[PDB]
Amino acid sequence: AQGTLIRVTPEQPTHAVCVLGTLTQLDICSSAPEDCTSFSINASPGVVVDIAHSTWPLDPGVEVTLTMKAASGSTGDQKVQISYYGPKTPPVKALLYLTAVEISLCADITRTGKVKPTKDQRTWTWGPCGQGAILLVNCDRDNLESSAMDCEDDEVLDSEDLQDMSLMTLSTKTPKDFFTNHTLVLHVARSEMDKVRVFQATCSVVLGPKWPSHYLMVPGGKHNMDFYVEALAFPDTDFPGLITLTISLLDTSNLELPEAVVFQDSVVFRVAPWIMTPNTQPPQEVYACEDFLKSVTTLAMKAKCKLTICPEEENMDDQWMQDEMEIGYIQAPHKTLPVVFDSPRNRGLKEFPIKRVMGPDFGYVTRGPQTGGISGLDSFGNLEVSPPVTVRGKEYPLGRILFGDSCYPSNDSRQMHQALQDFLSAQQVQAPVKLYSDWLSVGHVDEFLSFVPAPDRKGFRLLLASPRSCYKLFQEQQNEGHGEALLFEGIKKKKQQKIKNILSNKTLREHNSFVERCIDWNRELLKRELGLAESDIIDIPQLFKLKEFSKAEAFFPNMVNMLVLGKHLGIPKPFGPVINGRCCLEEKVCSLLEPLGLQCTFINDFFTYHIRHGEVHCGTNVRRKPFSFKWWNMVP
Amino acid sequence: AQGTLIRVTPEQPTHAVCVLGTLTQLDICSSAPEDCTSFSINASPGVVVDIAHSTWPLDPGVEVTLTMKAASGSTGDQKVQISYYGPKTPPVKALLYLTAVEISLCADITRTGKVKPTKDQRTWTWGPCGQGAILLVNCDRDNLESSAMDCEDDEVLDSEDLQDMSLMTLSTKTPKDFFTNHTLVLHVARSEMDKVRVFQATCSVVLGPKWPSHYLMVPGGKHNMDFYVEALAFPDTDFPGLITLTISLLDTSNLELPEAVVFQDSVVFRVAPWIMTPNTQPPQEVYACEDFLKSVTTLAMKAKCKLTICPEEENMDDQWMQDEMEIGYIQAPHKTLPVVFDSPRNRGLKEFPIKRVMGPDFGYVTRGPQTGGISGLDSFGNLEVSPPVTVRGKEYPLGRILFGDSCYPSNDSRQMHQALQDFLSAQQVQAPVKLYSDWLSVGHVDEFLSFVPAPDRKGFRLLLASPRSCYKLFQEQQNEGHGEALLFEGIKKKKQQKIKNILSNKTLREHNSFVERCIDWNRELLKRELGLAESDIIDIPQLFKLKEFSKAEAFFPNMVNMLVLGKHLGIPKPFGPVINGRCCLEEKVCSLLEPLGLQCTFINDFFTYHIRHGEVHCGTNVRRKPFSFKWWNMVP
Ligand SMILES: [Ca+2]
Ligand SMILES: [Ca+2]
Ligand SMILES: [Ca+2]
Ligand SMILES: [Ca+2]
Ligand SMILES: [Ca+2]
Ligand SMILES: [Ca+2]
Ligand SMILES: [Ca+2]
Ligand SMILES: [Ca+2]
Ligand SMILES: [Ca+2]
Ligand SMILES: [Ca+2]
């Protein structure tokens, strides 16, 4: 409804343009003739004049406003006439000729999947009742053979490409001669131009990193013009994630003067954030790079998932697929696609994300130096997310990002690279949470925690490693006369130990006391930030040993670090004291999990992983299904 | 109230620490003995146990919480005892020894000027009902002879220095032997450490750009410890402006293990923004660099202001003091001081801000390349601020920043450097607004606008240049027979012109029509963003001419560009057609302004400024008085 001031004079007629949807304002008094007390307005049928605070007295305070019903077929085909009169003097008329035109920029600001006419404009608001359009980055390659993301081009090399792009239309209705005297320009702020590209559909580029503005070629009369917009960047520290595109109507009718802006209108796009998927979400495809693969294969099957493997020659000795990448997604009403976050750690798998996984309808993103200057907390073993959760009346429908850290900064402390942290914060939809993982030798949060699907309560359980739980398990076991039982039996090479020997070992006990302290610190942490009760947590019996720098490791294969496919569990096989032909550990675990409807399967990673200081969940990766909840409907 | 989990066992006693202010939690069930149905709690007088959902049944769902009345005088001088009993079995007791200590980090989070004990913690909230501490950057030099700001040092070289700094105290109450087994550390995130420095008062540095953490040396018993914090950076694109300082309590009682964090607490500081002062605020000192100086001197006097001049040798030919700098301020409950924003334009005056103005209790800041790559919109002729204003129910108590720009980006368009814009946005307290000034040759907003104090309404008027107002003035003048009157009479060299000659000049008329369009675009702009009505605006008759690139200039000395000292006006003298021994222009102006209580004085800048394409307001600068309204009480 942003209008213009039109100043009219008795001396001469005035010619003005009026955009439909706009509220036009009239100045009578400035130019009003002397000796006239009062005034009157008369106008062609298509012009509706509302005049506030019949005849009227002449006062600078009275207000006259013009609105128009429809676009003009001809220049000046509507007119207003102002009669200035007074007691002894005959009426003196001022003439005004109006050309009404329809200029509307439309995008999908109702987030319904359908383009709508421009409502409180010029702002992007969160929630179900909010407004403003969504934009996706082009992180994939739909170009059958190309090694780069779609957005380094400046050109559209595919039909499917348009599907990721957001549609913006310009609707004009004008007299025919109109654009002889007027010219439309479409622009972005120089500050936002490197973050967006726009294409004209007949596809030719209009706006982009080198081009803040462009002149539209438009015919008089009724015309419609399609544009396709793509974002070149994710929200980040330097980029809040909003892009504004503006249409200006310029008056060129004077050659000796410069262009004169009559009218401006805009749309605001918000770049869609990168989102992680919790284990609570249903799986889609599975990732790993002979004993092992068949177990995880039957598993993946029972869970109805595809599978992909990376042969050595590509891997180049690197068996951890959990650490190099994280499969998230980006989402817009029109389009939803998976995007791979690629970790800066760069060891054996670095090419894998940029090559095999990235492709048609699979996006890619990365952060961090990649040159060096990196930590162990930089691998995605250390990046996780909770299931949807409500904390103290604040709703986190997409979950909450969890990543590991130290308690305070020191020389010997480790942390995730600042760039990653910042990246995660900039998405805003799942507020990241810092946990204390630096006590662990490797230092990953998945080492002490996991989440599982639950039929009741909040629909999930938090699993935490519990040395206490294990000590107690073994104690009860001894009490029943099994204290002679051998741990690590069934192993070609290993040093087997009896329950009574470990239970009587005081060093081990100090170690697991300390570990217990650490895991507990995190337990209270998670309770506060996830709003969890004790009924939401389950302790997995697990043992640890502090070794190098008193850094903690799994005493036996770490079970809480496990592959969760739906309700089918990819638990690492502890080789526990066998009792009644049954490992007491497996039995305890199942007695815990099965009541939830989960099935527990135990895979042997032992000489392949556990002795390499890793486990099942680590040598593996999963793509899951995007939340039904629309991120824009959140209000962070 | 963030606590710890204490797990107790019948097998052996447990020793734990409890911080006062913290809510401690007890786990009975995990370690509970078999054959016991129920349990009972008994505790020394100083320990209050609240146990929810007398005796009690043993269930994992029942919840037991410990709070302590006062700090322990001795290690373990409070104790809890849990009795596990059942029907056929005698009570079995578990012992727990508590040492209670007082650890509190205090800063001024009520923003009252007094340090308070740590309330919803760990967050900084806006408004009168919000919370969290304020921090000032050290932008000045209190070091009598030093060329640098106080914050490049790392050391405290003055007593007065502490006055800018914010006080944070640590209050401890502990048993004496306590710190034999425990150690306090104070830290900042590595991400925030370059933005803060902290000093220990006995002054020694503790935290800073190279040092994220430090070990506190604290005696047992009752002790108090002063720290003094200073910010090294203003809020900016990369720095939202929050600094968090944390205190951790580490348990070192085990040599073979690492430190174990018992307790953490924090304060959040918010770095104070840089704020501009509108002309509506009462003046303090005046700035300029022979006809002129005496006029502005009598003026400054009548307005009760100090004065300072810059001699040529320093100026080096540069007479514009308005363009190189802007005097704002930073504000904290404990301290409020002026800070100079120094423009990147860097011509003749560049040294002046970093030397003469910067000093004791005068801060300094700068943005932009300073190497080159600069515009004319980068001078502070182009930076202004409105008076306090309310727009559509949104309160802007500190005003709204206004700066000039183009309508859309082109090759030939100019803009203020992005770094400046970003800087201004990052302060948030006065939301900057973009106006269209690029039509002007110089392109400054002060060229077409000014603000003045008003006794009524909103307490100010917006003054806009009005070519229409001037044309009408001359027309009425001609009608009364003065059309022969000479403009520019009284000038040694100049081409004088009669009212009838300019009124009959059609080129001039087109030019001022276009200019009128531009100023009007801005008029509606300002009406929307400042929530102004027409009764708030006053049009100053002013004429223009488009010359180079059809860029606009003042036809005669530009009056709206004027020195406002309280109600005493520093208007540039137009040399107008003299009528009744009185310039019609001056007379019109006064007839407009005097009713408001303002006095109008007309200074001759003509051969010194106006012919250099500048005026009075431009060759001059003013320091005004900071708003009474506290910026933190705003809610942007
Ligand atoms: Ca493309
Ligand atoms: Ca694509
Ligand atoms: Ca990589
Ligand atoms: Ca695609
Ligand atoms: Ca992960
Ligand atoms: Ca200092
Ligand atoms: Ca100082
Ligand atoms: Ca400078
Ligand atoms: Ca000072
Ligand atoms: Ca200024």
mmCIF file of C-alpha atoms in Angstrom, chain A residues 343-561:
data_model
loop_
_atom_site.group_PDB
_atom_site.id
_atom_site.type_symbol
_atom_site.label_atom_id
_atom_site.label_comp_id
_atom_site.label_asym_id
_atom_site.label_seq_id
_atom_site.Cartn_x
_atom_site.Cartn_y
_atom_site.Cartn_z
ATOM 1 C CA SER A 343 33.801 -33.407 7.424
ATOM 2 C CA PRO A 344 37.122 -31.491 7.124
ATOM 3 C CA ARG A 345 39.034 -34.395 8.743
ATOM 4 C CA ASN A 346 39.973 -35.748 5.287
ATOM 5 C CA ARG A 347 41.721 -39.090 5.728
ATOM 6 C CA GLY A 348 40.894 -42.091 3.543
ATOM 7 C CA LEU A 349 37.314 -41.335 2.558
ATOM 8 C CA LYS A 350 37.545 -37.652 1.569
ATOM 9 C CA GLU A 351 36.765 -38.234 -2.130
ATOM 10 C CA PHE A 352 33.814 -40.489 -1.333
ATOM 11 C CA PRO A 353 31.353 -37.738 -0.291
ATOM 12 C CA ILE A 354 32.304 -35.438 -3.183
ATOM 13 C CA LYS A 355 32.010 -38.336 -5.662
ATOM 14 C CA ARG A 356 29.857 -41.417 -4.969
ATOM 15 C CA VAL A 357 27.229 -39.937 -2.648
ATOM 16 C CA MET A 358 26.965 -36.522 -4.360
ATOM 17 C CA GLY A 359 24.895 -36.606 -7.548
ATOM 18 C CA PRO A 360 21.312 -36.303 -8.842
ATOM 19 C CA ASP A 361 19.077 -35.072 -6.033
ATOM 20 C CA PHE A 362 21.932 -35.448 -3.548
ATOM 21 C CA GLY A 363 23.365 -32.198 -2.224
ATOM 22 C CA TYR A 364 26.789 -31.460 -0.817
ATOM 23 C CA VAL A 365 28.243 -29.009 1.704
ATOM 24 C CA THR A 366 31.485 -28.586 3.660
ATOM 25 C CA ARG A 367 33.168 -26.418 6.340
ATOM 26 C CA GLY A 368 36.598 -26.142 7.984
ATOM 27 C CA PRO A 369 40.163 -25.617 6.672
ATOM 28 C CA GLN A 370 40.662 -28.991 4.873
ATOM 29 C CA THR A 371 44.328 -27.966 4.659
ATOM 30 C CA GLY A 372 45.068 -29.077 8.221
ATOM 31 C CA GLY A 373 44.772 -27.627 11.718
ATOM 32 C CA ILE A 374 42.164 -30.159 12.762
ATOM 33 C CA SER A 375 41.010 -32.214 15.761
ATOM 34 C CA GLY A 376 39.493 -35.618 16.456
ATOM 35 C CA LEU A 377 36.292 -33.962 17.602
ATOM 36 C CA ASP A 378 36.022 -32.757 14.011
ATOM 37 C CA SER A 379 34.921 -36.164 12.759
ATOM 38 C CA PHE A 380 31.173 -36.796 12.688
ATOM 39 C CA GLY A 381 31.364 -39.515 15.251
ATOM 40 C CA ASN A 382 31.151 -36.318 17.297
ATOM 41 C CA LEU A 383 28.072 -34.887 15.581
ATOM 42 C CA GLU A 384 24.632 -36.172 16.590
ATOM 43 C CA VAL A 385 21.042 -34.992 17.092
ATOM 44 C CA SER A 386 18.308 -35.735 19.609
ATOM 45 C CA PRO A 387 14.747 -36.726 18.618
ATOM 46 C CA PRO A 388 12.000 -34.067 18.673
ATOM 47 C CA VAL A 389 11.732 -32.790 22.229
ATOM 48 C CA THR A 390 10.088 -30.088 24.365
ATOM 49 C CA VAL A 391 12.118 -28.278 26.979
ATOM 50 C CA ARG A 392 10.287 -26.141 29.526
ATOM 51 C CA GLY A 393 7.532 -25.182 27.085
ATOM 52 C CA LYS A 394 9.913 -24.558 24.188
ATOM 53 C CA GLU A 395 9.287 -26.866 21.238
ATOM 54 C CA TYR A 396 12.157 -28.503 19.351
ATOM 55 C CA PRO A 397 10.271 -30.460 16.654
ATOM 56 C CA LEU A 398 13.385 -31.152 14.596
ATOM 57 C CA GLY A 399 15.481 -32.162 17.578
ATOM 58 C CA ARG A 400 18.570 -30.574 19.070
ATOM 59 C CA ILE A 401 22.120 -30.917 17.741
ATOM 60 C CA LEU A 402 24.543 -32.514 20.193
ATOM 61 C CA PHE A 403 28.317 -32.371 19.796
ATOM 62 C CA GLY A 404 31.215 -33.116 22.100
ATOM 63 C CA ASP A 405 33.685 -30.796 23.743
ATOM 64 C CA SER A 406 35.883 -30.199 26.773
ATOM 65 C CA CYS A 407 34.699 -28.616 30.009
ATOM 66 C CA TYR A 408 37.000 -25.622 29.758
ATOM 67 C CA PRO A 409 39.662 -24.539 27.249
ATOM 68 C CA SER A 410 43.278 -25.549 27.990
ATOM 69 C CA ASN A 411 46.452 -26.395 26.062
ATOM 70 C CA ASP A 412 45.652 -30.085 26.147
ATOM 71 C CA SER A 413 41.930 -29.712 25.477
ATOM 72 C CA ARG A 414 40.281 -30.471 22.121
ATOM 73 C CA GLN A 415 37.219 -28.984 20.428
ATOM 74 C CA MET A 416 35.258 -29.099 17.188
ATOM 75 C CA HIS A 417 36.476 -26.510 14.695
ATOM 76 C CA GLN A 418 34.833 -23.143 15.221
ATOM 77 C CA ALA A 419 33.626 -23.003 11.617
ATOM 78 C CA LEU A 420 31.542 -26.154 12.049
ATOM 79 C CA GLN A 421 30.058 -24.969 15.333
ATOM 80 C CA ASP A 422 29.155 -21.658 13.746
ATOM 81 C CA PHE A 423 27.671 -23.425 10.725
ATOM 82 C CA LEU A 424 25.453 -25.517 13.007
ATOM 83 C CA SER A 425 24.325 -22.525 15.042
ATOM 84 C CA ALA A 426 23.460 -20.569 11.859
ATOM 85 C CA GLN A 427 20.812 -23.123 10.866
ATOM 86 C CA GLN A 428 18.951 -22.345 14.110
ATOM 87 C CA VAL A 429 16.320 -25.004 13.648
ATOM 88 C CA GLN A 430 17.969 -27.474 15.985
ATOM 89 C CA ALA A 431 19.888 -25.469 18.630
ATOM 90 C CA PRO A 432 23.211 -27.216 19.067
ATOM 91 C CA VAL A 433 24.205 -28.418 22.550
ATOM 92 C CA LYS A 434 27.764 -28.955 23.817
ATOM 93 C CA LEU A 435 28.472 -32.085 25.844
ATOM 94 C CA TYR A 436 31.694 -33.141 27.516
ATOM 95 C CA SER A 437 33.319 -35.823 25.329
ATOM 96 C CA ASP A 438 36.969 -34.763 25.629
ATOM 97 C CA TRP A 439 37.573 -37.306 28.395
ATOM 98 C CA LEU A 440 37.283 -40.063 25.791
ATOM 99 C CA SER A 441 40.437 -40.964 23.888
ATOM 100 C CA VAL A 442 38.722 -40.546 20.524
ATOM 101 C CA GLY A 443 36.292 -38.095 22.125
ATOM 102 C CA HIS A 444 33.024 -38.771 20.306
ATOM 103 C CA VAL A 445 29.561 -38.428 21.833
ATOM 104 C CA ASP A 446 28.369 -41.637 20.168
ATOM 105 C CA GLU A 447 30.922 -43.402 22.363
ATOM 106 C CA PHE A 448 28.859 -42.826 25.528
ATOM 107 C CA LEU A 449 25.345 -42.239 24.086
ATOM 108 C CA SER A 450 22.652 -43.386 21.651
ATOM 109 C CA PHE A 451 18.944 -42.823 21.043
ATOM 110 C CA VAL A 452 16.312 -45.457 20.301
ATOM 111 C CA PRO A 453 12.646 -45.558 19.138
ATOM 112 C CA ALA A 454 10.072 -46.120 21.890
ATOM 113 C CA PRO A 455 6.405 -47.159 21.635
ATOM 114 C CA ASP A 456 5.485 -45.004 24.638
ATOM 115 C CA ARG A 457 6.274 -41.885 26.631
ATOM 116 C CA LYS A 458 8.170 -39.460 24.412
ATOM 117 C CA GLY A 459 8.629 -42.199 21.841
ATOM 118 C CA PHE A 460 12.326 -42.697 22.439
ATOM 119 C CA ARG A 461 14.863 -43.695 25.037
ATOM 120 C CA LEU A 462 18.269 -42.221 25.733
ATOM 121 C CA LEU A 463 20.875 -44.932 26.120
ATOM 122 C CA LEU A 464 23.945 -44.089 28.158
ATOM 123 C CA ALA A 465 26.950 -46.291 28.884
ATOM 124 C CA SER A 466 26.877 -47.370 32.548
ATOM 125 C CA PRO A 467 30.007 -48.796 34.162
ATOM 126 C CA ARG A 468 28.024 -49.077 37.419
ATOM 127 C CA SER A 469 25.413 -51.197 35.656
ATOM 128 C CA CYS A 470 28.126 -53.570 34.454
ATOM 129 C CA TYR A 471 29.912 -53.800 37.813
ATOM 130 C CA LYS A 472 26.582 -54.670 39.388
ATOM 131 C CA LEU A 473 25.829 -57.222 36.659
ATOM 132 C CA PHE A 474 29.131 -58.992 37.322
ATOM 133 C CA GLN A 475 28.623 -58.751 41.078
ATOM 134 C CA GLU A 476 25.247 -60.461 40.970
ATOM 135 C CA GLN A 477 26.847 -62.975 38.616
ATOM 136 C CA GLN A 478 29.564 -63.740 41.167
ATOM 137 C CA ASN A 479 27.033 -63.992 43.987
ATOM 138 C CA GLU A 480 25.330 -66.802 42.079
ATOM 139 C CA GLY A 481 28.648 -68.645 41.828
ATOM 140 C CA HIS A 482 29.723 -67.656 38.325
ATOM 141 C CA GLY A 483 32.639 -65.525 39.519
ATOM 142 C CA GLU A 484 34.985 -67.934 37.751
ATOM 143 C CA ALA A 485 33.496 -66.967 34.379
ATOM 144 C CA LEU A 486 35.925 -65.896 31.652
ATOM 145 C CA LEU A 487 35.570 -62.605 29.830
ATOM 146 C CA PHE A 488 37.010 -62.499 26.298
ATOM 147 C CA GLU A 489 36.556 -66.249 25.816
ATOM 148 C CA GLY A 490 36.252 -67.325 22.190
ATOM 149 C CA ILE A 491 39.141 -65.090 21.139
ATOM 150 C CA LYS A 492 42.162 -66.539 19.308
ATOM 151 C CA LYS A 493 44.544 -64.009 20.817
ATOM 152 C CA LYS A 494 43.501 -62.189 23.969
ATOM 153 C CA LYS A 495 44.069 -62.216 27.693
ATOM 154 C CA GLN A 496 40.958 -63.717 29.272
ATOM 155 C CA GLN A 497 39.818 -62.653 32.733
ATOM 156 C CA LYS A 498 37.495 -63.952 35.423
ATOM 157 C CA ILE A 499 34.682 -61.850 36.865
ATOM 158 C CA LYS A 500 36.235 -62.133 40.328
ATOM 159 C CA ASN A 501 39.536 -60.776 39.007
ATOM 160 C CA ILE A 502 38.101 -57.640 37.456
ATOM 161 C CA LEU A 503 35.710 -57.092 40.374
ATOM 162 C CA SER A 504 38.722 -57.300 42.691
ATOM 163 C CA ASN A 505 40.714 -54.873 40.558
ATOM 164 C CA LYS A 506 40.828 -51.478 42.250
ATOM 165 C CA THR A 507 42.551 -49.506 39.488
ATOM 166 C CA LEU A 508 39.827 -50.493 37.041
ATOM 167 C CA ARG A 509 37.366 -49.356 39.682
ATOM 168 C CA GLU A 510 38.867 -45.887 40.059
ATOM 169 C CA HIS A 511 38.923 -45.556 36.286
ATOM 170 C CA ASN A 512 35.243 -46.439 35.910
ATOM 171 C CA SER A 513 34.407 -44.208 38.869
ATOM 172 C CA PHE A 514 35.921 -41.257 37.029
ATOM 173 C CA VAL A 515 34.338 -42.240 33.740
ATOM 174 C CA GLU A 516 31.085 -42.526 35.714
ATOM 175 C CA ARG A 517 31.585 -38.928 36.842
ATOM 176 C CA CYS A 518 32.016 -37.784 33.237
ATOM 177 C CA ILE A 519 29.065 -39.644 31.772
ATOM 178 C CA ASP A 520 27.006 -38.350 34.713
ATOM 179 C CA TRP A 521 27.959 -34.723 34.068
ATOM 180 C CA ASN A 522 26.623 -35.308 30.565
ATOM 181 C CA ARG A 523 23.544 -37.028 31.980
ATOM 182 C CA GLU A 524 22.503 -33.948 33.937
ATOM 183 C CA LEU A 525 23.458 -31.801 30.950
ATOM 184 C CA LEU A 526 21.159 -33.760 28.638
ATOM 185 C CA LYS A 527 18.432 -33.810 31.263
ATOM 186 C CA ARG A 528 18.451 -30.011 31.325
ATOM 187 C CA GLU A 529 18.847 -29.235 27.599
ATOM 188 C CA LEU A 530 16.560 -32.039 26.346
ATOM 189 C CA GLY A 531 14.055 -31.786 29.220
ATOM 190 C CA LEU A 532 14.353 -35.503 30.010
ATOM 191 C CA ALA A 533 13.240 -37.453 33.056
ATOM 192 C CA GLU A 534 14.885 -40.589 34.424
ATOM 193 C CA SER A 535 12.133 -42.707 32.878
ATOM 194 C CA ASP A 536 13.480 -41.523 29.527
ATOM 195 C CA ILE A 537 16.975 -42.852 30.192
ATOM 196 C CA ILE A 538 18.330 -46.403 30.106
ATOM 197 C CA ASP A 539 21.797 -47.386 31.269
ATOM 198 C CA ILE A 540 23.742 -49.901 29.213
ATOM 199 C CA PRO A 541 26.294 -51.838 31.230
ATOM 200 C CA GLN A 542 29.677 -50.777 29.848
ATOM 201 C CA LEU A 543 33.264 -50.820 31.078
ATOM 202 C CA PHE A 544 36.183 -48.493 30.319
ATOM 203 C CA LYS A 545 39.913 -48.077 30.828
ATOM 204 C CA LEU A 546 41.914 -44.842 30.967
ATOM 205 C CA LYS A 547 45.141 -45.282 29.030
ATOM 206 C CA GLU A 548 46.983 -42.550 27.171
ATOM 207 C CA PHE A 549 46.849 -39.252 29.039
ATOM 208 C CA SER A 550 44.257 -40.962 31.193
ATOM 209 C CA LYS A 551 41.976 -40.911 28.154
ATOM 210 C CA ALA A 552 39.085 -43.366 28.307
ATOM 211 C CA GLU A 553 38.531 -46.366 26.033
ATOM 212 C CA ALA A 554 36.042 -49.253 25.905
ATOM 213 C CA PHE A 555 37.150 -52.118 28.118
ATOM 214 C CA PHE A 556 35.156 -54.462 25.914
ATOM 215 C CA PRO A 557 33.435 -53.624 22.617
ATOM 216 C CA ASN A 558 31.261 -50.595 23.231
ATOM 217 C CA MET A 559 27.620 -51.542 22.913
ATOM 218 C CA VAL A 560 25.947 -48.149 23.162
ATOM 219 C CA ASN A 561 27.752 -47.428 19.912
#
